[PDB]
Design a protein around this ligand. Structure first.
Ligand SMILES: [Mg+2]
Ligand SMILES: [Mg+2]
Ligand SMILES: [Mg+2]
Ligand SMILES: [Mg+2]
Ligand SMILES: [Mg+2]
Ligand SMILES: [Mg+2]
Ligand SMILES: [Mg+2]
Ligand SMILES: [Mg+2]
Ligand SMILES: [Mg+2]
Ligand SMILES: [Mg+2]
Ligand SMILES: [Mg+2]
Ligand SMILES: [Mg+2]
Ligand SMILES: [Mg+2]
Ligand SMILES: [Mg+2]
Ligand SMILES: [Mg+2]
Ligand SMILES: [Mg+2]
Lengths: 102, 147, 203, 210
RNA sequence: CUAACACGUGCGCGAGUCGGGGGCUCGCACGAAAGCCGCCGUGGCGCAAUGAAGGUGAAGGCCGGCG
RNA sequence: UAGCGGCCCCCGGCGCGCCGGGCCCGGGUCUUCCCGGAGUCGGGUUGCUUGGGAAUGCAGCCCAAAGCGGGUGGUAAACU
RNA sequence: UCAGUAACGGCGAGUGAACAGGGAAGAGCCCAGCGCCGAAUCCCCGCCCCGCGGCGGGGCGCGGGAAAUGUGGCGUACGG
């Protein structure tokens, strides 16, 4: 039938072709570089872990996952950061277990 | 001008048009809107009902530009275009109808109030009302939406 | 280069290595006096980042500031007035301890100009900051085109006028909906612009 | 105290407003000084446009004004690159350039490209050395007719396109615009909850089948 | 005295009205005035109200065609 | 006093020429590499401030980071 | 101008911005880091030549020092 552009609805808005372009280089910040990963893992290897990080690692080792999440959230702050930190600590624990087994 | 003011005619009358019993003191009733609920309650209730209290929801970061939506009525609808347009459409025989765009003239919504002259019109707008739509259909014409 | 490694190290302040270092230094700084010139930066990377260059005319002063808040200097209690102003010993200073340290260094060394400062250690009762100063009349900087801005008279006592990086943070300067209090130069300017009558000639 | 009848007023004169009062007795002098500075700069830049660099076409960023067209801050790098202008040379030959602006669409980009090409076709470029001209330069004869122009260069216009009067067909006379708007509003409002209901109905059907 | 509001009065224009801010006028005795802008009416007030809001948004009366 | 009136002195700015000194410099296409600011952000609490309202901004104390990350999207929270 | 508006307030007295829009003006840039160049960098003392009342330019010094715990050139999010 008739499909007139409208100011309301799912497809609201004046129609116009949208041109693709390379994203601005400023959006690239935070992307992990190979050399930076090398440096960060070297520094982690020489330094170690924070006391709260190792306490949370013990909690994950005894497999109290909810306790680990709650403790990390309290110790660090936001739930998103807590989830990311818990995932990285579980990855570290898995790597350590695999190395010990092999 | 100070020439025409009441003060000039008031010189010599001790009192200055403010009474002898009750003088002209500083602030007999309190400053500003004081005593709105205590000793000016009668006046406030008699002349400004609904002054005290709360009602409705709070909208924090209000932006009037989102809600900007000027309106036009059908009696004014033919004034958007020139008279020569309307008369040419009137004495035209091919049945062609002129196109009136209210967004170009700065209106967003068309509301149907007035009587519409009997000739086809292509009204294109952003928002319409049911009565305006039915008026346009009855007079013969088309309603077109734009974004 | 080695700097990146250093920086990633200093970010790991809870590691035992850095913790031991910080403990030892803090002990040394506490043993020393309240304000004294350090021979060289303790954080070469941080001094680099803030603007230090290892050339003649750049000096670094290490200073300590007593920790805590700010209690109201009133005789016993006696902050006479309405109860809303009765507070004495839970108030907080409007400027940071870093800014206080920079201003103390600038006041002591009136012939130099403060560039920036950084944190080097702390304890229960002290905070230790190293502050970079520049001698504006040394030829090594007066003949360098890109650093001779600091030799202009306009840049006298930046720490006292709140123009350094640490001092600026307390002024509430920013862009966006969070910083409407300082549209214009500052809070003073915004308040002035909002609190005058523009009595036009015609009205 | 309130009189018989009237409006409740809230005059904002409870501060020391009389100390901060901005009288405008220097308004004509300010206008004269601004004028004098304007003509002084216009004389200073001898053949160059008095207004300044050309600027681009932009749309106002609001439902209230998105139908209008402004003069922007400066041309963006995508437009300069596709018009064949170097970002550093544009500023010194008279094109305002900013790098912040993006280009979501293509119509605006093409319009500004046309604007830049017209500006290149129209400008007269003086020799870098008055004795010997160069390749990227204008010949001598039209230099004698180079003059300052007043106002903005190629001023912005909001041009409206007429289409002629059309004849009605029955196809668009059966279009229920008001009903269409109402169902569009309803669909936009109920889209998500309908999706969730469809999802739970699907998982319930899967559970029943299994 | 300034600002705000209300009402009454006088004048101009009138569904419109108003340059107050800016600009153009060889800046300058008066003149810091006066004139002009009209694709400088942005904008204000008015032309539409109602609802807390999502929103909606201002006549109809007679004959022929299936009382 | 008016006057694109006169005379004298001094300083400047703009152009022209000479000597000496520095400078060897750009654009497009393809291939390969590289790219970021920490006791800081952020969280809790306390106090002040703001029109900013389950905290606008600032500061003290405690906790304290990440790298497809981080900040913002004016009502607290999880998912997207 | 938005606007005495959104909002705050014994929600009482009172307080109270911002975005968009039109104008005045209009100008953009530089480091650290990441890397590449025999530290390729800078300050000062002695002698010679120029003018020196805003102490500079050129040359000669197996003259001194700073600086590798990092000076200079390329280079900074618009990518290089
Ligand atoms: Mg009497
Ligand atoms: Mg009385
Ligand atoms: Mg009595
Ligand atoms: Mg009185
Ligand atoms: Mg204070
Ligand atoms: Mg902060
Ligand atoms: Mg009375
Ligand atoms: Mg009255
Ligand atoms: Mg307060
Ligand atoms: Mg929300
Ligand atoms: Mg109003
Ligand atoms: Mg009450
Ligand atoms: Mg206040
Ligand atoms: Mg604005
Ligand atoms: Mg302009
Ligand atoms: Mg370097």
């Amino acid at each position: 039938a008739l499909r007139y552009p409208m100011a309301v609805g799912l497809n609201k808005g004046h129609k116009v072709t949208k041109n693709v372009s390379k994203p601005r280089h400023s959006r690239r910040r935070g992307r992990l570089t190979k050399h930076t990963k090398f440096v960060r893992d070297m520094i982690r290897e020489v330094c170690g872990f924070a006391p709260y990080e190792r306490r949370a690692m013990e909690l994950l080792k005894v497999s109290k996952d909810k306790r680990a999440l709650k403790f990390i959230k309290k110790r660090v702050g936001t739930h998103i950061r807590a989830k990311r930190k818990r995932e990285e600590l579980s990855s570290v624990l898995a790597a350590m277990r695999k190395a010990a087994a092999k | 001008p100070s020439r025409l003011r009441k003060t000039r005619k008031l010189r010599g009358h001790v009192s200055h048009g403010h009474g002898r019993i009750g003088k002209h003191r500083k602030h007999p009733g309190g400053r500003g809107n004081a005593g709105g609920m205590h000793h000016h309650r009668i006046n406030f209730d008699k002349y400004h009902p609904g002054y005290f209290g709360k009602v409705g929801m709070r909208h924090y970061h209000l932006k009037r530009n989102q809600s900007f939506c000027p309106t036009v009525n059908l009696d004014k609808l033919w004034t958007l275009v020139s008279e020569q347009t309307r008369v040419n459409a009137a004495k035209n025989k091919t049945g062609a109808a002129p196109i009136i765009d209210v967004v170009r003239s700065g209106y967003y919504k068309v509301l149907g109030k007035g009587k519409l002259p009997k000739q086809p019109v292509i009204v294109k707008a952003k928002f319409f009302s049911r009565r305006a739509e039915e008026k346009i259909k009855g007079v013969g014409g088309a309603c077109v939406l734009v974004a | 280069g080695a700097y990146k490694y250093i920086q990633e190290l200093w970010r790991k302040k809870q590691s035992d290595v850095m913790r031991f270092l910080l403990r030892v230094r803090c002990w040394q700084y506490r043993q020393l006096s309240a304000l004294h010139r350090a021979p060289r930066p303790t954080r070469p990377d941080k001094a680099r980042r803030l603007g230090y260059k290892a050339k003649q005319g750049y000096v670094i002063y290490r200073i300590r500031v007593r920790r805590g808040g700010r209690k109201r200097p009133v005789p016993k209690g006696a902050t006479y007035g309405k109860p809303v102003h009765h507070g004495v010993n839970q108030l907080k200073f409007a400027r940071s301890l870093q800014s206080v340290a920079e201003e103390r260094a600038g006041r002591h060394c009136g012939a130099l100009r403060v560039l920036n400062s950084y944190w080097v250690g702390e304890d229960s009762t002290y905070k230790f900051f190293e502050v970079i100063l520049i001698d504006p009349f040394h030829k090594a900087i007066r003949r360098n085109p890109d650093t001779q801005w600091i030799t202009k008279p306009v840049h006298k006592h930046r720490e006292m006028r709140g123009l350094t990086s640490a001092g600026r943070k307390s002024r509430g300067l920013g862009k966006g909906h969070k910083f409407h209090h300082t549209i214009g130069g500052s809070r003073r300017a915004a308040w002035r612009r909002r609190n005058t009558l523009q009595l036009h000639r015609y009205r | 105290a309130p009189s018989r009848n009237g409006m409740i007023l809230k005059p904002h004169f409870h501060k020391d407003w009389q100390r901060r009062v901005a009288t405008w007795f220097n308004q004509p002098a300010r206008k004269i000084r601004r004028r004098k500075a304007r003509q002084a700069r216009a004389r200073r830049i001898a053949p160059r446009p008095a207004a300044g660099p050309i600027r681009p076409i932009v749309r106002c960023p609001t439902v209230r004004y998105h139908t209008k067209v402004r003069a922007g801050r400066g041309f963006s790098l995508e437009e300069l690159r596709v018009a064949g202008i170097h970002k550093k040379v544009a500023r010194t030959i008279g094109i305002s350039v900013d790098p912040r602006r993006r280009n979501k669409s293509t119509e605006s980009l093409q319009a500004n490209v046309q604007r830049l090409k017209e500006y290149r076709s129209k400008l007269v470029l003086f020799p870098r050395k008055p004795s010997a001209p160069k390749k990227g330069d204008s010949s001598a004869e039209e230099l004698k007719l180079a003059t300052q122009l007043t106002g903005p260069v190629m001023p912005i216009r909001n041009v409206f396109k007429k289409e002629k009067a059309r004849v009605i067909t029955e196809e668009e006379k059966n279009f229920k615009a008001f009903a269409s708007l109402r169902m569009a509003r309803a669909n936009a409002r109920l889209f998500g909850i309908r999706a969730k209901r469809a999802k739970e109905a699907a998982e319930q059907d899967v559970e029943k089948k299994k």
